[PDB]
Amino acid sequence: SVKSEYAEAAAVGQEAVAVFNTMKAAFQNGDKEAVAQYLARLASLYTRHEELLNRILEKARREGNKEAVTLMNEFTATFQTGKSIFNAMVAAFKNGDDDSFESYLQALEKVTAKGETLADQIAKAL
Ligand SMILES: Cc1ccccc1S(N)(=O)=O
């Protein structure tokens, strides 16, 4: 069902939260080799999450589930905010700009925390 597809999507999102917090600890410790690998792992996780979310939105549209479509349109828009911040973080790491990396890291945390009430609303709407 679309609801179980969203639970699978939610788990992938939680996998990225876990890897992100490990990556933050590695960044603070200066373990740049670990950070590089975690950033690659996060990129793959966000790509998978994005695709699952798009399939869920398209299915809600085909089902005529207007409220779930509204919420998923809002949620995917916020997802792209987080994705843009993530890509800027990756670039900051490439460039050796730790000041920007720290900034983007905190921003991605706040964007993600804000979007959690909506994430829960979607589970209930589908
Ligand atoms: C953190 C991140 C990274 C890439 C895409 C989306 C997100 S978010 N802010 O969890 O929607």
CA distance 97 to 47: 24
Amino acid identity of residue 52, one-letter, is L
Burial of 85 (0-12, 13-18, 19+ CB in 10 A): buried
Q: Write down the experimental method used for this entry.
A: X-ray
Nearest CA to ligand 1 atom 4: 83
Q: Which residues line ligand 1 (CB under 6 A)?
A: 46, 78-79, 82-83, 86, 108, 111-112
DSSP code for 115: T
List the resolution, Å.
1.6
Range of the domain at 117: 1-126
Close Cβ partners of 74 (under 8 Å, ≥ 6 residues apart): 118
From first CA to last CA, the distance across the chain in angstroms is 9
Total count of domains within the chain = 1
